[PDB]
Amino acid sequence: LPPGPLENSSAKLVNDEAHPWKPLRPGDIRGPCPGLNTLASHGYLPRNGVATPAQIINAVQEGFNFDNQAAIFATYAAHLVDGNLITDLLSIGRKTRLTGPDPPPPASVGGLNEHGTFEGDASMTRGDAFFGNNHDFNETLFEQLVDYSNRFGGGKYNLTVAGELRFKRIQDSIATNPNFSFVDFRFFTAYGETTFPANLFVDGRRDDGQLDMDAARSFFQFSRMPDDFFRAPSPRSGTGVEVVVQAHPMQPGRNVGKINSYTVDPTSSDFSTPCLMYEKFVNITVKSLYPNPTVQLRKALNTNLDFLFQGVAAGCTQVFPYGR
Ligand code: HEM
Ligand SMILES: *[C@@H]1O[C@H](CO)[C@@H](O)[C@H](O)[C@H]1NC(C)=O
Ligand SMILES: *[C@@H]1O[C@H](CO)[C@@H](O)[C@H](O)[C@H]1NC(C)=O
Ligand SMILES: *[C@@H]1O[C@H](CO)[C@@H](O)[C@H](O)[C@H]1NC(C)=O
Ligand SMILES: *[C@@H]1O[C@H](CO)[C@@H](O)[C@H](O)[C@H]1NC(C)=O
Ligand SMILES: *[C@@H]1O[C@H](CO)[C@@H](O)[C@H](O)[C@H]1NC(C)=O
Ligand SMILES: C=Cc1ccccc1
Ligand SMILES: [Cl-]
Ligand SMILES: [Mg+2]
Numbered sequence: 001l002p003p004g005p006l007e008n009s010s011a012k013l014v015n016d017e018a019h020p021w022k023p024l025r026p027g028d029i030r031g032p033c034p035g036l037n038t039l040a041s042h043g044y045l046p047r048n049g050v051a052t053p054a055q056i057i058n059a060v061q062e063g064f065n066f067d068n069q070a071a072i073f074a075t076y077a078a079h080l081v082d083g084n085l086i087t088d089l090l091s092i093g094r095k096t097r098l099t100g101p102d103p104p105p106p107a108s109v110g111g112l113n114e115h116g117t118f119e120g121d122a123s124m125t126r127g128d129a130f131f132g133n134n135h136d137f138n139e140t141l142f143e144q145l146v147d148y149s150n151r152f153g154g155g156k157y158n159l160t161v162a163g164e165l166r167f168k169r170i171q172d173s174i175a176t177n178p179n180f181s182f183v184d185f186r187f188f189t190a191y192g193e194t195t196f197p198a199n200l201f202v203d204g205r206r207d208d209g210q211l212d213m214d215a216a217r218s219f220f221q222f223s224r225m226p227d228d229f230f231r232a233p234s235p236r237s238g239t240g241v242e243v244v245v246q247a248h249p250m251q252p253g254r255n256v257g258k259i260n261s262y263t264v265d266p267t268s269s270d271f272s273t274p275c276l277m278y279e280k281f282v283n284i285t286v287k288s289l290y291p292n293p294t295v296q297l298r299k300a301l302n303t304n305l306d307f308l309f310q311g312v313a314a315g316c317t318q319v320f321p322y323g324r
Helices: 034-041 053-064 068-082 139-152 159-176 184-200 213-220 241-247 274-289 295-310
Strands: none
Touching: 034 053, 034 213, 053 068, 068 274, 068 295, 139 159, 139 213, 159 184, 159 241, 184 213, 184 241, 184 274, 274 295
16 A cells, blocks of 8 residues: 655655665666665665655655655656566666566566666756766756855755756757657656655755755765755645746657757647656556556456545546456
8 A cells, every 4th residue: 555644754864774764776766766875875765776656655754754745746647658567666776676476568677777768858957868868966966056055046956947957958859869758657657756856855954946956966976875864844845836837838759859949749738737747657557558457457457546536636536447
């Protein structure tokens, strides 16, 4: 079952004796998410980077005070498209045999590194998959985050910086990635993720939304909490995303096999249709990976789809691609 919210959601030391940072061992997996990477590298998750959905939800709440609804939606979305539904295991990075025997194609069970399922283009500190690596920390891109922080944040990363950098990354992908895709699920996640460093990597004793560059590097590059790091003082995820969107409002779309060909997609969800993003994710994305599942997979799909729906904002109607 999906874990419930924290019983005590106060700020507290999370870089503590029970959760020390350790370097990677051979075989340890890290991926495109600095939050999950940091939780693995402090032992909030298994240090090898393979975890159950329940482990992930507990870790993001306990270590960072990620809110329960957001934790549930993100975790089960990722698990449905990137995880093994029979073994209940998900890699936070590359595809691995450690998630167990694979389902039939076209399901990939590729981990969070799988491009175009959860992971996608115009990430802040990771390159687009077209350029050869969608998961490793990129120093040039991080230095650009530093530059934007210097220009728009007085040297700190905040929501103003996020609004400018988010747009810059989009414009850079339009100009250079002929396969750039920015629709549906990625269109939503790309905006919310830009708020996370301001909401969740800021020491919770301050919680002022101003992330210093030393802390930013520690999380983004080294998957490491600052010495004496306190988590946020209340549950949150994407609060202030409105600021990021308002800076440079965009329509969902894609380049069409050439640079500088960004073409709006009217069949995409956008922020005016959040229930459509959920419905397409289930009806198109999940269904295409598992078009005619065998009995044990159908059962696992339906269970995880029920859990996914628990993280969907009230107002939306549940959809049932495999029946009830
Ligand atoms: C709850 C489960 C979570 C899952 C399954 C997850 C997964 C992912 C994935 C696959 C990406 C890649 C998107 C991209 O292409 O850029 C991503 C990005 C990101 N995640 Fe998470 N994440 C979760 C929670 C969190 C939390 C709790 C934090 C912070 C405490 C966080 C911080 C970030 C950041 C900053 C990025 C953007 C990295 C960048 O653009 O350079 N995530 N996450
Ligand atoms: C919640 O945890 C904080 C910090 O660890 C502690 O000081 C506080 O008293 C706790 N609240 C309850 C109701 O136990
Ligand atoms: C190119 O875009 C398509 C979806 O539009 C996606 O399936 C494919 O994986 C992308 N490849 C790269 C390398 O970006
Ligand atoms: C990092 O990003 C830059 C800027 O897009 C790119 O040119 C470079 O090849 C990427 N990879 C590395 C390893 O620096
Ligand atoms: C970001 O920092 C700059 C410089 O301190 C400031 O002008 C701006 O109001 C900040 N934005 C937010 C959302 O805190
Ligand atoms: C998803 O499929 C259901 C049928 O199970 C249908 O009612 C709904 O309109 C579909 N939504 C989309 C966006 O395709
Ligand atoms: C940072 C991963 C994630 C989690 C929830 C929404 C968008 C992205
Ligand atoms: Cl919560
Ligand atoms: Mg990416």
